[PDB]
Amino acid sequence: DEFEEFPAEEDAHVWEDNWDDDNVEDDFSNQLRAELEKHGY
Amino acid sequence: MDDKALLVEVQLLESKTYHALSNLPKARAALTSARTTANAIYCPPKLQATLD
Amino acid sequence: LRPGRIDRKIEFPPPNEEARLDILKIHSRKMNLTRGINLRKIAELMPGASG
């Protein structure tokens, strides 16, 4: 029962990706280095 | 080659080095082979002590 | 053992070299053999295996 009444209107990734992957932030190494530097003094 | 005393010594050394690397199964297999070759030749007191 | 009660007496000689290889293949089918497991050498090491 094709609902023709409603019109029927790169990233070839095979792995499922959750939302957290999209979030943009400095690499973990930079974060850890900065935190250790700031807690070193 | 037929020099089995040096073979026993070398197998014992390999077993010891295997144990030092945490590869216990292979170390035990090497020690079993060394014991098998030792119970086929004259094991002097020093070699017997090392094997034991 | 008269040829009217027992007609055919089939002998079962101990397997020969090719027979030993065939038996090894038969009993090693389900085994996990490793490349370089030449069975002809093993069979040659069994001169008169019962089967």
Partner: protein, 379 residues
């Protein structure tokens, strides 16, 4: 198996493709030496066009002429085998032609030649070898469809009949592909199965294989299986004795030394960024490892002050608060933060409560299915 195609070449190409290492010199020299020794003319041209390098006219012409005359010799040998020699000779000649085609980097020509050889090859072992060669090509180029289809074909060939060595090699190949697809559970399973008898030295040396196995096992295996299969594993421990960094990283999680664990995790994230296979998934690996460490710490506590856990992780209170909030928002950690008193309280569901939730969910799914079936059939 043959080293061709050399996955080190693909790794170097990806490393150069990385932004920071695009200008690296030593990798440049290594890749150029590999290209010259192997005489990959099509690969050289593709790499030059992709990386916008300056094509060496003399070297390029020399490589092209060498490839041309080698191909002419191979074609002459193929014609001679076709005219005079039997089917086996022609099959081997076409196999050699395809091998050299893969040598220079011609993906399409090499694939077509290997397909023809497979069509003209009857021996099951040679068909498996051809499938392995195509799988290696796919890994070198990262063609998902090619790798999937060829893995299915290799599985079918092994099921029909196959030696144990080919099964082990195919297990390692599936593990590598799974690591490249981010299905880390299957990667850990396969690699832990094959670590005892690693015989596929063409893809990667044993040290790299053990490092990958440790990484994927820690991202996938839980604590009991991790202890039983990785911590106490003789092969993995023996290999790790030569890799202090990987050994420290693995033992940090099991021994509960979280600051060293985070140092090693930063090092591992940096290492995977450069790796050609873990590069697409390095962020996910680091995030999941951090989540696993947080959950492991919280398993033995019900309410631990943010200060204590910040000290344990060698990080500030603010960073741990932000990370814990982010991970709680995603429903990964079972805890609720209390900023005013700075106390983290674990809300791990009771066995009865979790069982009730699971039964509710599964029964809802089954009831939706039953309702759909009843609607479909009742007319």
């Amino acid at each position: 198996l043959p080293k061709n195609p050399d996955l080190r070449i693909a790794q170097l190409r990806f490393l150069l493709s990385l932004p920071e290492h695009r200008g690296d010199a030593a990798v440049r020299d290594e890749l150029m030496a590999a290209v010259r020794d192997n005489n990959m003319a099509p690969y050289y041209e593709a790499l030059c066009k992709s990386l916008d390098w300056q094509i060496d006219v003399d070297l390029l012409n020399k490589m092209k002429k060498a490839n041309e005359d080698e191909l002419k010799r191979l074609d002459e040998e193929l014609e001679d085998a076709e005219k005079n020699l039997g089917e086996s000779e022609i099959r081997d000649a076409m196999m050699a032609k395809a091998e050299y085609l893969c040598r220079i980097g011609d993906k399409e020509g090499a694939l077509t030649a290997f397909r023809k050889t497979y069509d003209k090859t009857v021996a099951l072992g040679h068909r498996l070898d051809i499938v392995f060669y195509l799988l290696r090509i796919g890994l070198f180029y990262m063609d998902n469809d090619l790798i999937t289809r060829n893995t299915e074909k290799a599985k079918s060939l092994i099921e029909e009949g196959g030696d144990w060595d080919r099964r082990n090699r195919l297990k390692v190949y599936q593990g590598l592909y799974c690591v490249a697809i981010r299905d880390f559970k299957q990667a850990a399973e396969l690699f832990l199965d094959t670590v005892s008898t690693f015989t596929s030295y063409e893809l990667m040396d044993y040290k790299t294989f053990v490092t990958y196995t440790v990484y994927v096992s820690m991202i996938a295996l839980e604590r009991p299986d991790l202890r039983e299969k990785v911590i106490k594993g003789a092969e993995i421990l023996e290999v790790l004795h030569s890799l202090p960094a990987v050994r420290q990283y693995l033992f940090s999680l099991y021994e509960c030394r979280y600051s060293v664990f985070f140092q090693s995790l930063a090092v591992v994230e940096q290492e995977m960024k450069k790796d050609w296979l873990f590069a697409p998934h390095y962020r996910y690996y680091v995030r999941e490892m951090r989540i696993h460490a947080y959950s492991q710490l919280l398993e033995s506590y019900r309410s631990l002050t943010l200060g204590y856990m910040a000290e344990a992780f060698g990080v500030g209170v603010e960073f741990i608060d932000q990370e814990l909030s982010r991970f709680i928002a995603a429903g990964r950690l079972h805890c609720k933060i209390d900023k005013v008193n700075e106390i983290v309280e674990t809300n791990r569901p009771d066995s009865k409560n979790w069982q009730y939730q699971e039964t509710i969910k599964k029964g809802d799914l089954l009831l939706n299915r039953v309702q759909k079936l009843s609607r479909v059939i009742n007319m």
